[PDB]
Write a protein that binds this DNA or RNA. Structure first.
Ligand SMILES: [Mg+2]
Ligand SMILES: [Mg+2]
Ligand SMILES: [Mg+2]
Ligand SMILES: [Mg+2]
Ligand SMILES: [Mg+2]
Ligand SMILES: [Mg+2]
Ligand SMILES: [Mg+2]
Ligand SMILES: [Mg+2]
Ligand SMILES: [Mg+2]
Ligand SMILES: [Mg+2]
Ligand SMILES: [Mg+2]
Ligand SMILES: [Mg+2]
Ligand SMILES: [Mg+2]
Ligand SMILES: [Mg+2]
Ligand SMILES: [Mg+2]
Ligand SMILES: [Mg+2]
Ligand SMILES: [Mg+2]
Ligand SMILES: [Mg+2]
Ligand SMILES: [Mg+2]
Ligand SMILES: [Mg+2]
Ligand SMILES: [Mg+2]
Ligand SMILES: [Mg+2]
Ligand SMILES: [Mg+2]
Ligand SMILES: [Mg+2]
Ligand SMILES: [Mg+2]
Ligand SMILES: [Mg+2]
Ligand SMILES: [Mg+2]
Ligand SMILES: [Mg+2]
Ligand SMILES: [Mg+2]
Ligand SMILES: [Mg+2]
Ligand SMILES: [Mg+2]
Ligand SMILES: [Mg+2]
Lengths: 65, 144, 81, 61, 190, 142, 101
RNA sequence: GGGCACCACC
RNA sequence: ACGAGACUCUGGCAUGCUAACUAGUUACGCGACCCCCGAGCGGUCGGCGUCCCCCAACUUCUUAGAGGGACAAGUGGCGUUCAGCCACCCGAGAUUGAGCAAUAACAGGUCUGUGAUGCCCUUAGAUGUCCGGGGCUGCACGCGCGCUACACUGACUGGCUCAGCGUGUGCCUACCCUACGCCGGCAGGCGCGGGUAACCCGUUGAACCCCAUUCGUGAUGGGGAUCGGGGAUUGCAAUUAUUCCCCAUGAACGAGGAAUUCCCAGUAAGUGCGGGUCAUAAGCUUGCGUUGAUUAAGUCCCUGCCC
């Protein structure tokens, strides 16, 4: 996941007394579309959906339509 | 109940075919057969003085099994390992002037002919001779 | 070793808490339910979660577990107690 | 005399490098008999050991 | 059908006289094979090599030294010739001779070392049956190997002589001498 | 006479042998050659094991032709054995009852499981820093 | 009516298979005869180098690898329809070559 | 005083 | 929360799916040869048709896509009966091998990889840059990584029979892989073709291994160092021998002291083959197959590192 979730950049800047080195790492957010982030999620993130409300059955009802 | 070449043992077949070629007496033998070794990785000349007939028989059998082989293919067939002093061994090919003369001598017997694609193959007469030799080998093996 | 990391255990416990009715003692039916309800981006992780869910369901059937508690189980224990 | 014994339970690993195994062995002639022995080599329960001298006993761990 | 090693040596008549080693020598009906070559996976799990036939174990242990590693067809041929020579010399089943040699060659009591690199002190211990079989096979192969070196005598003849002497119990064999010395040292380390 | 035949393969490290088994009189050949002419002849019994275990009676109604390729000599022999056994079992399954297949399969499996189930072992990759997969180059101090 | 061969070369398989599926669907929507796609063996270029810019330390090696995938499609059709279906096929990363045998 | 490792031993 | 796991590549299973003349199988025609005592619905064929006007089907074998499949799931024990461990059934598989890899540091290596770079030094009699010739390899002696051996489980001479990973005609840039025919005893030389590659080399006729022959415990037909005389290739140029070939010569070495290295299954070892370097070119390295084990399923005694 480092390959597609992390963006890295290394640069050099020449100042009066020598060279300084700059390293920047940015971790992209999860985006369902591929616009500003990876489409696929992190491998170990499991999202369990919340169950929907169900009406408790009381009496057998037959509906014809 | 017809015997073919693949049915019999190959070493006995080579021996019998070499004996047949020697007894025929129409094979042409180079003058330098007694002064040469068969490859550059060999140390000595062949022990058997009638080695030319054996090599011709082996070449005919190989052309029977896999036709269209040229001088380079025969050279690769008979190549072997070369030990060179204190250095590691390596694969080495045979002598081209022996393979070429064996093929030419077999063509002189009307047993080998030029292939259309390239190389040499067997004539129907050569195939007939090899099948007859195979039948003789099988009969000798079964009778004893 | 075959110890399960906390990811699998947490996912299995949450699945059992939320969907106790749909689960059972069968590994294959459990692994079919898990992909229906949960989002696991790996096949091996889904298999591990289902295999722990089956073990936990068997343990629950044997008796109460130190961790998760089912609403139906709590209501039944109220009648027991 | 030479005796034969049956390994009843494997106890542990002894030795400076752990080379020996401490086990409990019961004599074939007298099933009531049982001592503690040190064995060299892989040994499991049910093996038969040949005791050249059967009086010696080993200091268990 | 009847399965005979190399097509001529049967296994029904062979019997093992040691109760301890019965569970670790595989020569009997379900372990009867035509050749000592099976390409099996016996080293995958512990104690699994007790199910390997003993002839194949001898064949495996005969592929030494490093100039002979992996050459198992030559070893099978050597074993075949040695069995033929043993049958000619003794007149009995060479499988029985091999079983007797392995039974006699296995040390029964050993000495375990507690050594500060120079000086070593020892204490007598017992030997498990599996180690007895292993050490017997190793001793027999080593004796044959040392006999055949720098001598006009085939490795098969030396192996046959070593096996015959070990089965006979004679001290002319390498394995019997080694076993005797190991047991003497173990006795003195009690 | 319906044309009934089965082609089944067997494998060793890289060697693959495919056996075509059809209705016939008892012919069994490998690359056109008889079983007794395959080399090396040191391992000839390994090649005759299925026939000896099952007898010529069960092979007397089929013709089998094997084509081998890849690997070495020993691997090719061990592939040929498995191809022959599996081809006979698959033929009996389709064109004979299930009981005969069960008998043959039990007999073959009791003697050796590699007659019907392949060996998964393959060569391991070399790693830099040593001659092979596990061995390392000789270390030196001072 | 010409026998026309389309050769598709790519470095990733997802785009290559997407393009192949698009071409097959487009051609078969015109009631044409299509053979393939037949997949050639994958090519693997390897470069093994030392990690260190100098000659100091443990001898460690990088193993860089590039994979090339190749597909073939055969079509019995006139040139114009092939160019019609090909014009859409332009995709980033896939090299498409059309030849008339 | 414990734990681990064929770049430790057995 | 990072690291560990998860993840990616890889190796094993699919007669289930998708579909192939740059992969094949089977069948059917033509042809060659053998058996006229069984001549046949006979055997062998890497010999030719079967897609391209019309003259066969199908993916088992070969390639590579999509999916399945294994989770300590089932059983029996041992455990706080938990976390987990052992064994067994079924099963292709009940631990395949690598890649990536945290917080903190080292005056660790690299200015000789860079048109990365700060300061010094030099800059026309140059520390710039070309040309010619030498050196880096020089030998009383010590130390490492290795190759070949000390033989009969061998050497020699014949015969027979099996791989896999890969490369190949180049902006400058000259230098590619080679089938077949002839000449030479060999290194090689002439012709004439294919390949920018599942198409040609190539069915990559590899070596160990296997079957026969000779030798016979003799520093021997083991071993092949050091030297002499010839021949040929690469180059502008071969002497301080580039490499290769042929006759001849025939050293130490009979298994190695103190000490010490690597390794747990297709592994160690044996044996060859590709790539890098490469006008000429492997005793090195990095990969690939082939043959294929002994021993162990433990411990903290030595060494070392952590709590
Ligand atoms: Mg050869
Ligand atoms: Mg040599
Ligand atoms: Mg000898
Ligand atoms: Mg290997
Ligand atoms: Mg190796
Ligand atoms: Mg040691
Ligand atoms: Mg398939
Ligand atoms: Mg410093
Ligand atoms: Mg630098
Ligand atoms: Mg600089
Ligand atoms: Mg500077
Ligand atoms: Mg430098
Ligand atoms: Mg000049
Ligand atoms: Mg100069
Ligand atoms: Mg130098
Ligand atoms: Mg070094
Ligand atoms: Mg060395
Ligand atoms: Mg080396
Ligand atoms: Mg040999
Ligand atoms: Mg010699
Ligand atoms: Mg000779
Ligand atoms: Mg030879
Ligand atoms: Mg000499
Ligand atoms: Mg000599
Ligand atoms: Mg000269
Ligand atoms: Mg010089
Ligand atoms: Mg010479
Ligand atoms: Mg050390
Ligand atoms: Mg190499
Ligand atoms: Mg080179
Ligand atoms: Mg170098
Ligand atoms: Mg310690």
């Amino acid at each position: 996941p480092v390959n597609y979730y992390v963006d890295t950049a290394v640069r050099h800047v020449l100042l009066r007394q020598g060279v300084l080195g700059i390293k920047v790492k940015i971790m992209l957010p999860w985006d369902p579309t591929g616009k500003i982030g990876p489409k696929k999620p992190l491998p170990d993130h499991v999202s369990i959906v919340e169950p929907k409300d169900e009406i408790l059955p009381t009496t057998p009802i037959s509906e014809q339509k | 109940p017809g015997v073919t070449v693949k049915d019999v043992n190959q070493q006995e077949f080579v021996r019998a075919l070499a004996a047949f070629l020697k007894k025929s007496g129409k094979l042409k033998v180079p003058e330098w057969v007694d002064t040469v070794k068969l490859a550059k990785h060999k140390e000595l000349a062949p022990y058997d003085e009638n080695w030319f007939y054996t090599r011709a028989a082996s070449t005919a059998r190989h052309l029977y099994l896999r036709g269209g082989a040229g001088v380079g293919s025969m050279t690769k067939i008979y190549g072997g390992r070369q030990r060179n002093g204190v250095m590691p061994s390596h694969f080495s090919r045979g002598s081209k002037s022996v393979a070429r003369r064996v093929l030419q001598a077999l063509e002189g017997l009307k047993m080998v002919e030029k292939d259309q694609d390239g190389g040499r193959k067997l004539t129907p007469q050569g195939q007939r001779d090899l099948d007859r030799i195979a039948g003789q080998v099988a009969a000798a093996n079964k009778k004893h | 070793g075959r110890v399960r990391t906390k990811t699998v255990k947490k996912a299995a416990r949450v699945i059992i808490e939320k969907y106790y009715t749909r689960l059972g003692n069968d590994f294959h039916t459990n692994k079919r339910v898990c992909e229906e309800i949960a989002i696991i981006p790996s096949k091996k992780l889904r298999n591990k979660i289902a295999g722990y869910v089956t073990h936990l369901m068997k343990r629950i059937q044997r008796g109460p577990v130190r961790g998760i508690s089912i609403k139906l189980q709590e209501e039944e224990r109220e009648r027991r107690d | 005399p030479i005796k034969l014994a049956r390994v009843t339970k494997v106890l542990g690993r002894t030795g400076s490098q752990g080379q020996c195994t401490q086990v409990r062995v019961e004599f074939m002639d007298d099933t009531s008999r049982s001592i503690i022995r040190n064995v060299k080599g892989p040994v499991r329960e049910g093996d038969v050991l040949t005791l050249l001298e059967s009086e010696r006993e080993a200091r268990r761990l | 059908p009847d399965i005979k090693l190399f097509g001529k040596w049967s296994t029904d008549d062979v019997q093992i006289n040691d109760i301890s080693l019965q569970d670790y020598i595989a020569v009997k009906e379900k372990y009867a094979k035509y050749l000592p070559h099976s390409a099996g996976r016996y080293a995958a799990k512990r104690f699994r090599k007790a199910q390997c036939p003993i002839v194949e174990r001898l064949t495996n242990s005969m592929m030494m030294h490093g100039r002979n590693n992996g050459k198992k067809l030559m070893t099978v041929r050597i074993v075949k010739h040695a069995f033929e020579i043993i049958h000619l010399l003794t007149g009995e089943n060479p499988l029985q001779v091999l079983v007797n040699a392995i039974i006699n060659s296995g040390p029964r009591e050993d000495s375990t070392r507690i050594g500060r690199a120079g000086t070593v002190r020892r204490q007598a211990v017992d030997v498990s049956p599996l180690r007895r079989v292993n050490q017997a096979i190793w001793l027999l192969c080593t004796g044959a190997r040392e006999a055949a070196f720098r001598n006009i005598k085939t490795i098969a003849e030396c192996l046959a002589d070593e096996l015959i002497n070990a089965a006979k119990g004679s001290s002319n064999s390498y394995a019997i001498k080694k076993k005797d010395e190991l047991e003497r040292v173990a006795k003195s380390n009690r | 006479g319906p044309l009934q035949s089965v082609q089944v393969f067997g494998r060793k490290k890289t060697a693959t042998a495919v056996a075509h088994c059809k209705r016939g009189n008892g012919l069994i050949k490998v690359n056109g050659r008889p079983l007794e002419m395959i080399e090396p002849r040191t391992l000839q019994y390994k090649l005759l094991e299925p026939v000896l275990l099952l007898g010529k009676e069960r092979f007397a109604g089929v013709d089998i032709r094997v084509r081998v390729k890849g690997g070495g000599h020993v691997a090719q022999i061990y592939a040929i054995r498995q191809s022959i056994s599996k081809a006979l079992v698959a033929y009996y399954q389709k064109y004979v009852d299930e009981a005969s297949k069960k008998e043959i399969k039990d007999i073959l499996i009791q003697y050796d499981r590699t007659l019907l189930v392949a060996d998964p072992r393959r060569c391991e990759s070399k790693k830099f820093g040593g001659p092979g997969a596990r061995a390392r180059y000789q270390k030196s101090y001072r | 009516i010409h026998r026309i061969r389309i050769t598709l070369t790519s470095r990733n398989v997802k785009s290559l298979e997407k393009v192949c599926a698009d071409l097959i669907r487009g051609a078969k929507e015109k009631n044409l005869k299509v053979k393939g796609p037949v997949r050639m063996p994958t090519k693997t270029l390897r470069i093994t180098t030392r990690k260190t810019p100098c000659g100091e330390g443990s001898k460690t090696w990088d193993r860089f690898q590039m994979r090339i995938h190749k597909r073939l499609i055969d079509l019995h059709s006139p040139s114009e329809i092939v160019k019609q279906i090909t014009s859409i096929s332009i995709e980033p990363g896939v090299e498409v070559e059309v030849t008339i045998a």
